[PDB]
Amino acid sequence: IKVGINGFGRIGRIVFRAAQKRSDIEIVAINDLLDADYMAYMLKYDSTHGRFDGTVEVKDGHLIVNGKKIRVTAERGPANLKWDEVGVDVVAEATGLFLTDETARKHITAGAKKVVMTGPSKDNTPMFVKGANFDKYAGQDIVSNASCTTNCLAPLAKVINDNFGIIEGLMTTVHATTATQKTVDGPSHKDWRGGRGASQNIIPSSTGAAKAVGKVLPELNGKLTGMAFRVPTPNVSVVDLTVRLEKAATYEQIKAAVKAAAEGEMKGVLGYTEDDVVSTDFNGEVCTSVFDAKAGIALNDNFVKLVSWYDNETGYSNKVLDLIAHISK
Template structure:
């Protein structure tokens, strides 16, 4: 995604490329205009979203996959966001329209008509959206399009050097919608206040880190975390196999996703130490991939510094969910299951009835997250935050 200021408008671009399904090559400035509207330019599989800045939205998606399409949906449902262009060298505008319009999990797109005007133009209602088809990020004319921010959503260009290719195309900022080994990571509600305007390439971390970090922040600030283990029970993603297939680096990961519970690795818990340095080295974790198509849940088991009853812990989380972390951290006491959280835009929804304590210093906490919609919502929020930081 890219942001730029043209005629008192902030423009954001998204680029999506249709390389390999999610994880490899995916198959898949804040300023108000005269009307107080924000333009977001999203580049979808080489596409852009244009946002008029009442918030800063800049986005580049290399891959019109799950996150790419859903970030576009989130942006388009905002009153301050306008889609202006997409970029994808691998799919036609007809197929792009189909993929955006129909979604097995999140339903039909009903907020505006979407149709093809020609091979290089989509129509969202009466709004024309330009479609580019460049394979090399350096060749996408971000500068000519007036874009300043790019959201890198391929899962490929996730380090500083690779993501910098977008800067060569004219982008001013790059938001990586994945964990990064060397780009600064920011989690909304946790450490976004540490962002400085001279940082040109940043990461929104992972969906699991976005769920875990807000919960861990509250617990550590209120009671202190000595150490902990995290397990995420995670829905299927596009990197997995529909039937048993080759996966030389992760043999179990090559087994049929819809028939198995698959143990897997995750760096989400360790990544919390990057956004909350006080917890660096205190958390680690693993994942179980399970045969559900969306919504995941974090199981965080920690040893506390300060003694606390489970009721006290619940009260602390509830207070934060209704205060400064409202919209990021949620709190529920109803007897809910995973499908009840589809479309929930919060990063982490604490399940008060699901947790347990062994003692006043050893507790298991459970928090849900829509790993698609919640994460996509945070990408857009981070763009807004970056755009508003001077």
């Protein structure tokens, strides 16, 4: 599978890094508004993920990564990208600018066969989350991989709902700082809290991840909503899910049910630990949802708070590639 990346931001770069360790996917082209030498620097050095484990060199305005040449472009309009030349099958839409059908379809008019959006859709483009509803993919040519937080919540919510039935749930994610935030108090006209200094503050934030679960798991439609707190850590976030269960279930039953999925049909997607973990212990986590057995607490058999960690860059990026491979089957 030959794939091109549009947007070499946080997600595009780690999608690129993760794709190197895969045998079924080849990155052949990248498009961003930055020169290739700068793109090389951003790939070689990363304050969160360490130095690139490979070779990066610039030759004639293009990138040579581990011997393979990657066509570099800097086109602003996605109709122009000429995806035909390097022969790309799927395009990873990681700019955040093109989250509709008409936006991303310009990739298909430019020669790509299918595209995966590295963010939640803004129209009705179908969203797919591994562990949740990958098995419901119906050959659509443009898909969304939802968001970091949905990829953490949905697999956990599916296991809980399938074994015990979620009547209703309220969610809080304690989220690491992201590129949208400011170093000091600065302008953020659509989200006033979000403009305050990120390193000084716990910042409440809205989120649609809890309701978006209703789209990937229609059973839970209208039963979850939530919010977020942004805190001054560079990476790794944690979901705090408070749910009511129709079927009584002790905490040990919940642990066993999650551990079973983590070792079975959801291996590599849902993780499970009983160790004294903290957030940095998941820097690099490929699982999109690691259940923290000892951090959760139950008030009784039908009212429980469940905790699950996610590397909001590494897990999401690896599942973007899983979605790319899945829609290419």
